[PDB]
């Protein structure tokens, strides 16, 4: 019997863990959202997948649904996952962030599934923010830098309380960067990629981002989910980092997924009023607007998953390179039929 | 100086709104959820039109939004819309659609435009319930029966108290049931019309309903959102029944669609046992299923707008043939592009 | 087998209601809010009765507490029950006694009970504000005047909802103002009562009041505590008015209350300048202020109980003389000390 | 000039606070929640005060207050504060104490004042619950234990973030124990020196307790407060321990309390079946219950307050001694009297 209820089954990971444990075997079922237009475009293919509506933020729909499901697994991928809109959404991202993890928790325990099911919660590189050491490890202390990390660290340690207080086999995947082809258009890669790919098919000349020099690990969801999956295989419930190790930064996402394209960007100016120009044509295709800056940003990222490599025999596939080419390259296809 | 501020701005309503202003040469703004996807389909070609990520249910967003955009009309359409899905996610549907709608009136009154600001709420035919009077108009008394229609009471009554406490300029359009093209899939109407024009394409042989015995007075959203904006112009706040007055039933929709793509329902059988095939094919081409049933259902509404003919001069333009016709012919458009 | 949980258990009719049931000798379970200072004052004497922490805004607890006491009836008493401070907290006042209701209502179909719980909602008069008729009845149409009001209409339909939907007994009692000795300080009869009794005290020398214009229908809470338990005693959920029918201005319990210290109040001027003097002495103790009056005032209110007189043959014992000497009896004693 | 805005005033903490800020000319204002009973017994000797009725899970009447206030110093001391009550009220507990400090920061900025005020958060040595290091100071690393501590933990991050983003004088002051004649009865030490008082007046023989084992580092409240005052007048806004770095068990709490009666204490037995009993006479005066343990215990803290002695100049000035003797003889007057 295996029997999976997935919060945040629309999104990104949603979506691949979906087709994962779908692979395996499991039947799996998932939390959407009421949305007044379509919004499951990830996962409209797959459908042993069964959809329930919901919301993080009111727990008598998790206990009805908990209970007509009875899970032997739970993977609370449910956020509001952006930081730049975590600002100004504080409230709003600390009650599904924080206290929705909590309500699905105590569902859990409400429908007397304490000691049957398995946990994971879906947590996040951001929790390190002001990095306290380089590489950043399991025992690495945390430091958040805005109030999507808050919130994620509240529901990082009261998932470690329900483990403590109840034998809850609950664990944090402590996950750094990743993006896919279904990244979330506002986020810096798939933003990145879908404005190059848009520049290259002739749909626009130009795009704006933030900080430039923000340095982060990035890795393929699709081979993170795999780690979520293996995290509740494992005999003991523990905590893991889970990255690639190695760190590259905006820029040069910018400036290889240009490559991709058959351009080549050359840098002029600072701060704000910095361009990234073709080599060639000498056409600016990259501005900089600090409307997209953080108040406190995250500088750099460097997860360190010796734990996990070790212990669940996981680790990364697709490499930095190979992920940025990807990604241009399926945003070119979409935009074709565009 | 006309400038509006939507929310609910990406449904049915607040895209046909959005236009209407437009037109006018307002200045429109509109709240938007963070979602994991794309969510802006019926408003994407209007890119004089401001989007801001917000949501009802997170007081301090509301009020940044309004110090930012300084609206002189405020469209409260936001809220989960559905009366189904409110009875298993009736706490979020109090939540957005009760108490957001005080959070938006507070905002209102902590950004100090009381006594400038116009503001239209969404109230509903649904608040009639099993009604109390036929036809309905401004005077008939509420009888909710599902978490949404209670949800809209409450907001309903907090809309008028700021009015009768405050002297805010803040009115109740009491909408009957109105759809078109851009009608959410999961609503009767663009239900049956999504799945009559797949049948006619061959991309689906039967569909199921629920009950087939309601009845409703049916108009179309665009000829509605002028009515909100007329509400907006009358010289005091006043609220008022928007409807056609006119009355079909579930049966009915379904036949006049099927007669659109040249086919004729014989209905057979009763209750879930219920079955309408093609009377010159005998092929079964609509079933019922009792989970689309709802536990206290709304057996008939009627709406009687008398009072908007005499302040505000208003009448449908669209009656329920064209309405049909419409959305059928639509939907057979979109799904053969698809 | 009879055990209530109730909540707002340590409010007025929380405390009268817990003293008639454990006389019946139900188990009594009661929801308290966590304080930093002692705040079971109207029941410590009862401590048959068990107490839980909890808040009608933590759905978790509410399917916990209700989950181990597997209450046969429940009386959803708790509540921000004051209309004017409603105007200033409006959001919490929607959140506890709107949302608070569907939290209890959800918790008991969670628990699996709806249908061996009858439960009781503290609907009221406030209902009707602005009132449509009058006196006002059952069938009378509701016309909210404070987030107060309107939160308690939420409540009162959403109550009705899981009645019709899922066959929950589930009743709305609408009470019309009911005080006692044990009325909270910041309502109008007993911001009067302890005010006179400190003027008879020497404690105090005058008090500000806001409309003294304003109607009601006053009785007292301990009779009407047995009539929600008689709702509840009901072969089907009914929904009933209790009330006296007799009606009373602010400016009469304010004169009959003086009258009880050996004081005969003599109004003068109008408005925020309208005063009470002292017949005898000459001294001002009543004054009015803008600041105690609500944006949209409940002008009058009276309630027809006709029906719950004839289908649960309840009928108020004490009637508004006695009421008010009661009242300012108890606080000249409990100012004593 | 200055003009204090206390939330939790009517608390232990509370009321000293204000009496400390009185007596230095303060114009101290508090937030009072709406009670059905008479609830500022510890602050109505005081009657240059103001008292305003709010919450801290609602943002509307905060900004109002603070709007009115204008304050030029805020103490957060507001909070559900128990944490064994924290267990069954865990999302009470973090709507106030964790999402509630955050509306209380957006209050301040929507009010204008975020570079006006400063900003004191009532942070908690329970933050560092499984203590990682031995004694506690600023630097070492948090680990929460119950849904308190998480609650807290969300708190004192998002203080730092509005300190970093939006250069607000805030600062975490990361009190230890501290107690006092007014502190809450269900706290331990209060709840052992009211019962060891009315075993010395003959109103009641034995009482029960939970884990005796524990070990806390217990200062008085009132020098306490002084130590939030002065970390609101230091240049810049830094966090900083407050303790007596000196630890003692709830046992020898016992032992030194039954002492002041003209008692020794003898304990017997183990676990759940402990006992104290009169050496003289014999009788059991003390027994323990389980349900007063918690799930997640947290054995003992110790603080180290050299940061604060050196940049504050602060000490503590009551020993346990002497807390442990002023505790019993107040409950015993208090009780004498009833
Ligand atoms: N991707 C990354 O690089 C990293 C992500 N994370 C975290 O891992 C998880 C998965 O991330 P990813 O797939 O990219 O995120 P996405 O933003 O793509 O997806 C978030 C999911 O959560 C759902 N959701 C949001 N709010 C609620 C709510 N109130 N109730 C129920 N469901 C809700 C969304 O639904 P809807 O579609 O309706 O919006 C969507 O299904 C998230 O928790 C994220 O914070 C951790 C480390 C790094
Ligand atoms: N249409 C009808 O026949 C009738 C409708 N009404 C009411 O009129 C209004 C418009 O109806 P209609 O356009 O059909 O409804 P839709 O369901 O099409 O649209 C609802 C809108 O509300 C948004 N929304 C939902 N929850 C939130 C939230 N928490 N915060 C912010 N925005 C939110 C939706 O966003 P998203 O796209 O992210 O879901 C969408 O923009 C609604 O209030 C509805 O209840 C009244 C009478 C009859
Ligand atoms: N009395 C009247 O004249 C009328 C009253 N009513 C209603 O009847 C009920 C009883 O009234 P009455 O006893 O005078 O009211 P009180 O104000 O004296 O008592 C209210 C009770 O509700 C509790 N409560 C408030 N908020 C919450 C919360 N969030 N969670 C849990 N408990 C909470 C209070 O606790 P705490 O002590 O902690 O504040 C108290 O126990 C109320 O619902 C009131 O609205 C109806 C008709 C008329
Ligand atoms: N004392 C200690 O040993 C330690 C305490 N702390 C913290 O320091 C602060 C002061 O502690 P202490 O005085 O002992 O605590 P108390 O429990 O004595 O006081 C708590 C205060 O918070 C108020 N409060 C609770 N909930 C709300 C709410 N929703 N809205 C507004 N006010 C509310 C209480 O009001 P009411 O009277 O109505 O309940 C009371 O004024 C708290 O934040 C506590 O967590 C930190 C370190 C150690
Ligand atoms: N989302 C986003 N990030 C940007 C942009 N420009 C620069 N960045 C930076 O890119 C980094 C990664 O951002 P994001 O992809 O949102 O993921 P995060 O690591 O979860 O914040 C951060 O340092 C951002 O500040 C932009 O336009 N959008
Ligand atoms: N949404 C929906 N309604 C259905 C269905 N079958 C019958 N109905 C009924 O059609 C009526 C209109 O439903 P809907 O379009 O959702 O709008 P409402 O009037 O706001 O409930 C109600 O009486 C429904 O019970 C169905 O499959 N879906
Ligand atoms: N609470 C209160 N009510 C007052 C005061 N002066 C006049 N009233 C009026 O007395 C009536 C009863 O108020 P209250 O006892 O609060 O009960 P309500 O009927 O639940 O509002 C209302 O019309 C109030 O406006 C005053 O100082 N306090
Ligand atoms: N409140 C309380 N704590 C007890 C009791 N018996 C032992 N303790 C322990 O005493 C310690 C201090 O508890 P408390 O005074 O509530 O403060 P905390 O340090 O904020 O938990 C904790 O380890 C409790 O488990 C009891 O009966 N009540």
Same mark, same amino acid.
């Given at each position: 019997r295996n029997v999976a209820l997935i919060t945040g089954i629309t999104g990104q990971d949603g979506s691949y863990l979906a087709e994962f444990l779908l692979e395996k075997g499991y039947e799996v079922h998932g939390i959407v959202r009421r949305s007044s237009s379509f919004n499951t475009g990830r996962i409209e293919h797959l459908?042993?997948?069964?959809?329930?509506?919901?919301?993080?933020?009111?727990?008598?729909?998790?206990?009805?649904?908990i209970n007509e499901?009875?899970?032997?697994?739970?993977?609370?991928?449910?956020?509001?996952?952006?930081?730049?809109?975590?600002?100004?959404?504080?409230?709003?991202?600390?009650?599904?962030?924080?206290?929705?993890?909590?309500?699905?928790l105590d569902a859990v325990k409400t429908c007397g599934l304490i000691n049957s099911v398995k946990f994971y919660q879906a947590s996040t590189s951001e929790l390190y923010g002001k990095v306290q050491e380089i590489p950043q490890k399991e025992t690495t202390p945390f430091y958040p830098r805005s109030p999507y990390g808050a919130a994620k660290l509240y529901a990082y340690?009261?998932?470690?309380?329900?483990? !403590?207080?109840?034998?809850?086999?609950?664990?944090? =995947?402590?996950?750094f960067n990743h993006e896919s082809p279904r990244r979330?258009?506002?986020?810096?890669?798939?933003?990145?990629?879908?404005?190059?790919?848009?520049?290259?098919?002739?749909?626009? !000349?130009?795009?704006?981002? =933030?900080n430039l020099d923000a340095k982060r690990d990035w890795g393929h969801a699709k081979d993170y989910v795999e780690a979520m999956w293996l995290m509740l295989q494992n005999? !003991?419930? !523990?905590?893991?980092?889970?990255?690639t190790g190695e760190v590259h930064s905006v820029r040069e996402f910018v400036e290889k997924s240009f490559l991709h394209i058959g351009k080549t960007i050359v840098w002029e100016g600072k701060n704000e009023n910095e361009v990234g120009r073709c080599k060639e044509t000498g056409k600016?295709?990259?501005?900089?607007?600090?409307?997209?800056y953080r108040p406190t940003e995250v500088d750099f990222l460097q997860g360190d998953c010796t734990k996990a490599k070790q212990?669940?025999?996981?680790?990364?596939r697709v490499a930095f390179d190979e992920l940025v080419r990807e990604m241009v390259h399926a945003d070119v296809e979409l935009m074709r039929t565009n």
């Amino acid at each position: 019997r295996n029997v999976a209820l997935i919060t945040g089954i629309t999104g990104q990971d949603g979506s691949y863990l979906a087709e994962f444990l779908l692979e395996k075997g499991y039947e799996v079922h998932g939390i959407v959202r009421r949305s007044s237009s379509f919004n499951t475009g990830r996962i409209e293919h797959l459908y042993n997948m069964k959809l329930h509506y919901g919301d993080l933020t009111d727990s008598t729909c998790l206990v009805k649904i908990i209970n007509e499901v009875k899970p032997t697994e739970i993977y609370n991928l449910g956020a509001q996952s952006h930081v730049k809109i975590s600002f100004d959404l504080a409230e709003y991202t600390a009650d599904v962030d924080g206290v929705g993890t909590l309500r699905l928790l105590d569902a859990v325990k409400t429908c007397g599934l304490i000691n049957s099911v398995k946990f994971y919660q879906a947590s996040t590189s951001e929790l390190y923010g002001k990095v306290q050491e380089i590489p950043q490890k399991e025992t690495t202390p945390f430091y958040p830098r805005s109030p999507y990390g808050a919130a994620k660290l509240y529901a990082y340690w009261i998932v470690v309380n329900f483990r !403590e207080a109840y034998n809850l086999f609950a664990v944090n =995947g402590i996950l750094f960067n990743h993006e896919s082809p279904r990244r979330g258009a506002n986020f810096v890669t798939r933003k990145i990629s879908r404005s190059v790919a848009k520049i290259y098919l002739g749909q626009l !000349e130009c795009f704006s981002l =933030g900080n430039l020099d923000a340095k982060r690990d990035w890795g393929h969801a699709k081979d993170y989910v795999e780690a979520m999956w293996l995290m509740l295989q494992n005999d !003991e419930p !523990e905590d893991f980092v889970i990255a690639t190790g190695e760190v590259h930064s905006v820029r040069e996402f910018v400036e290889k997924s240009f490559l991709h394209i058959g351009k080549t960007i050359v840098w002029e100016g600072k701060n704000e009023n910095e361009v990234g120009r073709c080599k060639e044509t000498g056409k600016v295709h990259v501005t900089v607007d600090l409307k997209y800056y953080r108040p406190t940003e995250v500088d750099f990222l460097q997860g360190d998953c010796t734990k996990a490599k070790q212990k669940l025999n996981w680790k990364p596939r697709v490499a930095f390179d190979e992920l940025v080419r990807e990604m241009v390259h399926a945003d070119v296809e979409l935009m074709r039929t565009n």
